[PDB]
Amino acid sequence: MKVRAQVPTVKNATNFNMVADSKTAVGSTLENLKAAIAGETGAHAKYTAFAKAAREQGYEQIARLFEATAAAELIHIGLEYALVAEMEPGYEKPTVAAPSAYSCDLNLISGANGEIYETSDMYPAFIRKAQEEGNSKAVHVFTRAKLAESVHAERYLAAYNDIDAPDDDKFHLCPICGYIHKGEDFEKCPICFRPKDTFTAY
Amino acid sequence: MKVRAQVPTVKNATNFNMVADSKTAVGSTLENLKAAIAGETGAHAKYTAFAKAAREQGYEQIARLFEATAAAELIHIGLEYALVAEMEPGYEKPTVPSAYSCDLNLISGANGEIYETSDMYPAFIRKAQEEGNSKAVHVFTRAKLAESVHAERYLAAYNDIDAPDDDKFHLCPICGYIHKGEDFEKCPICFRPKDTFTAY
Numbered sequence: 010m011k012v013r014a015q016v017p018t019v020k021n022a023t024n025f026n027m028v029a030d031s032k033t034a035v036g037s038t039l040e041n042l043k044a045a046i047a048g049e050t051g052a053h054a055k056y057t058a059f060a061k062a063a064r065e066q067g068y069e070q071i072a073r074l075f076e077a078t079a080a081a082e083l084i085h086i087g088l089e090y091a092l093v094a095e096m097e098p099g100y101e102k103p104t105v106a107a108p109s110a111y112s113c114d115l116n117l118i119s120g121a122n123g124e125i126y127e128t129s130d131m132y133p134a135f136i137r138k139a140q141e142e143g144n145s146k147a148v149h150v151f152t153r154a155k156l157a158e159s160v161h162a163e164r165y166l167a168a169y170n171d172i173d174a175p176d177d178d179k180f181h182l183c184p185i186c187g188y189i190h191k192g193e194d195f196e197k198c199p200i201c202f203r204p205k206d207t208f209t210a211y
Numbered sequence: 212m213k214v215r216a217q218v219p220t221v222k223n224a225t226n227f228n229m230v231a232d233s234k235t236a237v238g239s240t241l242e243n244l245k246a247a248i249a250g251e252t253g254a255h256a257k258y259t260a261f262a263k264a265a266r267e268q269g270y271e272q273i274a275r276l277f278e279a280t281a282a283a284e285l286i287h288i289g290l291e292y293a294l295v296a297e298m299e300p301g302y303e304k305p306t307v308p309s310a311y312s313c314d315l316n317l318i319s320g321a322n323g324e325i326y327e328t329s330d331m332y333p334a335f336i337r338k339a340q341e342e343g344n345s346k347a348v349h350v351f352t353r354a355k356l357a358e359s360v361h362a363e364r365y366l367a368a369y370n371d372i373d374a375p376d377d378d379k380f381h382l383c384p385i386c387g388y389i390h391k392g393e394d395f396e397k398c399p400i401c402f403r404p405k406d407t408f409t410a411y
């Protein structure tokens with residue numbers, strides 16, 4: 010993902026449309042924030058299981074990608090939780106069980122499909138609802154998550170295509186958003202502009 | 212997709228597993244080759260429609276990507292048709308879509324490519340192996356490998372939808388491999404040199 014003159018938003022980007030045949034239940038923004046947290050909690054558990062399986066299967070770099078992406082989902086949960094907490098202090102983040110991890114290639118495909126669903130269906134649906142309800146804070150949070158998900162999808166597909174050609178590149182995760190970069194060739198986050206030196210290496 | 216020391220095959224690669232919950236109807240290899248052709252004919256019509264829409268929507272580079280990928284599917288059809296014709300000389304290729312916003316078309320493309328690379332082609336490859344049809348295994352493998360490359364290209368384009376550049380998309384002469392830019396020496400799927408590629 011290229012760095013643009015300004016950070017991408019629904020006001021200056023053209024990949025924020027929701028698939029017409031959406032599989033997402035849309036409620037109030039508060040309900041959507043909770044739904045997103047629930048979904049991301051599941052994603053985190055899935056990627057964590059996928060990472061453990063990848064390591065056992067001999068795919069250390071892919072394991073690191075799953076670990077970096079799980080960490081990215083945790084950042085999303087944090088952003089969403091902060092908003093829910095201000096509106097409903099009694100709200101407690103949910104916990105989920107770990108799902109099964111299968112062959113690494115299929116896990117990468119499962120990951121890619123989930124990321125695509127989140128970036129083109131779920132988050133766009135929630136962003137639209139937040140816009141229609143005037144919840145700018147939610148639009149911001151959902152937008153940041155949405156942008157990282159399509160990057161995650163690309164990273165998973167790249168890893169799938171090069172499943173038998175790994176390298177020593179580290180995956181750098183942004184400190185405040187889910188952006189992940191493979192390798193050292195970048196200066197700042199294309200989603201939030203945080204400098205490279207603030208990223209965490211996986 | 213990185214160029215390996217060896218040409219990727221179902222024998223030396225580890226991304227040929229098929230999804231457990233398949234949405235593919237599997238029959239004889241002959242029927243599967245025809246099903247693949249029907250699917251690719253649909254894909255070609257789809258990408259051609261997406262390219263047309265992309266140009267009208269102001270995304271010239273993405274339009275070129277859709278055009279290059281449509282050409283890639285045509286190459287797949289050619290490889291599959293050649294085999295079907297041999298197994299049934301008089302076979303006639305079928306004829307066949309709705310286009311939406313550019314970003315959604317890229318996603319629809321990515322989803323179709325993912326289905327073909329992780330569900331359809333792997334299923335057809337295994338059935339061909341079971342029936343001992345080496346030619347079909349080869350054709351399906353070559354196609355399968357290109358589809359995941361197409362998926363990545365579509366997601367990359369989606370992520371940079373508002374940040375296009377002047378890179379050309381180079382399509383391999385005998386397989387569906389597409390490379391963005393001129394930083395490559397040969398096809399990672401069939402090893403054809405860059406000089407034999409067609410730019411889009």
Ligand SMILES: [Fe+2]
Pocket residue numbers: 078081082124157158161187
């Ligand atoms: Fe994600």
Ligand SMILES: [Fe+2]
Pocket residue numbers: 280283284324357358361387
């Ligand atoms: Fe394709």
Ligand SMILES: [Fe+3]
Pocket residue numbers: 049052082085127158
């Ligand atoms: Fe997510």
Ligand SMILES: [Fe+3]
Pocket residue numbers: 183184185186187188198199200201202203
């Ligand atoms: Fe960031």
Ligand SMILES: [Fe+3]
Pocket residue numbers: 250251254284287327358
């Ligand atoms: Fe295809």
Ligand SMILES: [Fe+3]
Pocket residue numbers: 383384385386387388398399400401402403
């Ligand atoms: Fe090739």
